[PDB]
Structures are given as structure tokens and as C-alpha cells.
């Protein structure tokens, strides 16, 4: 009677880039959990903490659905642990997690023949970031702390572009991601 808005966040037309991932809280509905069981559409579908039979248990306090776009080589970093250029600078999952990580290949949409330069990823930042904390600030990095303005002496801009094409391999093709996170915590539904 009230189907949850999985039909908005999964089938969207522009996922945000991984430095500026969004989040849509979903509550007070009924979750279908049966249209995302196609095994040749998605790729990963790996879940920690709970099994992949979530149609029965109503882990339904809230479900936070983050979503971004990563390169094919580093969709493995969307996982607990996993030190790397994506996962300790852009989106750090905590060590415990009841979350569900889903991903899928989108060479058809997000990659062109001339070259996509619209998705970004922050690659160089002062230290690690904690679980679930994002950064959107684009100020130029300098390894001393004091600020620069590049192209001056050995201090660059803290972002890069994925550079998506349609001629490259699998590992450089875009993978759209959506990360659920069940947060049961003794609430009403």
C-alpha cells in the first residue's frame, strides 16, 4: 500500500560523484526487496552483518541509502577495512556495519566516445577521515599546511577526474554504487 522509494534512488539519471555522495533516508513504508534480486543486472550485492534474505526480518527503523559512482578497479574499497585512495579519503565505511553494498556496470550511460570528465574523486587530503564523514570543500592542498595557489611550487589541487571512455577495459569503466545501512537500534517499526 505504501512502497518505499527504492524506485527513485536506484533508477536515477545522475548519480553524484564519490567526493560528494548523497543520502536519502527511507522510513514508514513497506520495502519490496524483490526487484533487486536480479543476478545478471547487478554485480556485487555483498552484505555484512545480515544475510541476503531480508524480506522476512523487518530491520526497519531507518535505512540510509548512500549512492555514488566509482571506477571499476576500486569498487572493492566500498567495504569495511580496505585502506585505499577511495575509501580513506572519500567514503569510509565503519568496521562494524549492518550495511548492504550494491553495484552495477554502467558503460552504456556514464561513459561516452569522446570522454566523460564530469565525475570526480578526491585523492589527496590531510589524513584519513572517520566513518561516514564526507568532505565537499575544494581548497588547494599544500604539504606544509600553509596555503598555496597552484601551479606554484609542489602543491596541487585535491581532486581528479575519472576520465571515462567507451574504448577502455573493464577496470576503468564506471560502476554505479548504492550502499544501504540498516540501523535497527530498538525503535518502533
Amino acid at each position: 500500500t505504501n512502497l518505499c522509494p527504492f524506485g527513485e534512488v536506484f533508477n536515477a539519471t545522475k548519480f553524484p560523484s564519490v567526493y560528494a555522495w548523497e543520502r536519502k533516508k527511507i522510513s514508514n513504508c513497506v520495502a519490496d526487496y524483490s526487484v533487486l534480486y536480479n543476478s545478471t543486472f547487478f554485480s556485487t550485492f555483498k552484505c555484512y552483518g545480515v544475510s541476503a534474505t531480508k524480506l522476512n526480518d523487518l530491520c526497519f527503523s531507518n535505512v540510509y541509502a548512500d549512492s555514488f559512482v566509482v571506477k571499476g578497479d576500486d569498487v572493492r574499497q566500498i567495504a569495511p577495512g580496505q585502506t585505499g585512495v577511495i575509501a580513506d579519503y572519500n567514503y569510509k565505511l565503519p568496521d562494524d556495519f549492518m550495511g548492504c553494498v550494491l553495484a552495477w556496470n554502467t558503460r552504456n550511460i556514464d561513459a561516452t566516445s569522446t570522454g566523460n570528465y564530469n565525475y570526480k574523486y578526491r585523492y589527496l587530503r590531510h589524513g584519513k577521515l572517520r566513518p561516514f564523514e564526507r568532505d565537499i570543500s575544494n581548497v588547494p592542498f599544500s604539504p606544509d599546511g600553509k596555503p598555496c595557489t597552484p601551479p606554484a611550487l609542489n602543491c596541487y589541487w585535491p581532486l581528479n577526474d575519472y576520465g571515462f571512455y567507451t574504448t577502455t577495459g573493464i577496470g576503468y569503466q564506471p560502476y554505479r554504487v548504492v550502499v544501504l545501512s540498516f540501523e535497527l537500534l530498538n525503535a518502533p517499526a
Partner: antibody
Amino acid sequence: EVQLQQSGPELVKPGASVKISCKTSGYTFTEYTLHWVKQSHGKSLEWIGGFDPNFGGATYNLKFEDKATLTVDKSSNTAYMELRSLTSEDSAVFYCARGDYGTSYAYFDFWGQGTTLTVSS
Amino acid sequence: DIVLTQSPASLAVSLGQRAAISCRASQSVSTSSHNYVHWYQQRPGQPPKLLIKYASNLECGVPARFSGSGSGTDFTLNIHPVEEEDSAAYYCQHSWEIPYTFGGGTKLEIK
């Protein structure tokens, strides 16, 4: 040549919708996208929202998310911009601009003649 | 979102000198590879037209007198040879985030 055109201009009194069209010609329609802008008689431009004919969906600016919707017929290669709840501030030009391939658009290279709305009584 | 301010408001130039329209951004726009700002001129009563893509590259079908500059927050448009036809409104456009806003707009008047 790249041929973009809209329909004729129209005036509608406040409280009624309007369906602007944009017919295109000169390229394969499913490759490139279409976008729309608005500029109110001496002010600056602003981006309304684009359509992906290949993927099927549509994206919007958050400032225009309610009053405008986008709808495309793929065979006739016409996009149907449509507004509702028109007031005096929705009285401006309306261009039908062409971007790049889906979810990679950065510059609207080729444009159309543009239609003007004037709410009246 | 991101708002673009323009300076000067109405710059008047003559044929022997150059015109400098300065489009300053709110936050930083550039990455290490590209610079995400594109330009547009608009002759009156007519739709706009692309001049510069990605702040340095000029389009095909240009009179080769339009070339941009700047990286970071500061961006500008250079017209070193000036003649009669480029008396129009000139617009800035950023591509950093999904909502794209356009700039304010300056005019060019010749004595």
C-alpha cells in the same frame, strides 16, 4: 546542418498549463541530450533541466523541481517542456538547447530560436 | 549552489585596446586536469552561442580572437582584436555540480 526549432509563441492567462515543443533535425536523436533555460527580459540565464532520451529519465534543477516536467516522444524527435501554475514571474524566454552524450553534458553548443510567454488578463 | 559574479558591469572598449571580462566564482571550480567554466556570447534578439569550452579551449567556428585564461577562482575572457560585430552580452557558465548556474553578464560598447 543542425536544425533546432520550437513551436510558435503563446500567451496563457494565469492558472493554466502550457506545453512548449521543440522539434529537432540533423542528428541521431538518441545520442545527444536536450536541456532548457529561462531568462526574464533583461535578467540572467538559469538552467531548468535536461532529458536523457537514451536512458529514459530526466533531471531537474531543484529550484524548478515542481512547476516543470519533461516529456519526450522519441519517434518524432520532439521534447515537450511543460509548466504549470503560471504567474507573472514565469514570463520569459524558453530555449531548447542541445548538450552532450548522457550524464556528460558541460556546454550547450547548439540552440533554438526560443519562445516567450506572457501571462495576461 | 554556486553563484558567479562578474566584473565590470558594463565595460566600454575601443578598437585599439583589449577587453577583459572577469568572471569570479564563489568557491573553487578547477580540478587538476580541467577547468570547469564555459563562456557564451549573445547578440540581442538571438539565442546565445558557445565561445570557450573548459576555460582555455576555443570552439571550431570562432574568429580566433576569443581565448580565455585563469584557473582556480579567477577566470577571464580576452578579446585582443576588437571590431564592430562583437557588441553583445557575454555570459559565464560553470559545470562543477549538477545545478549549473549562469553568470551575471556584461556588455561591450564601442565609441
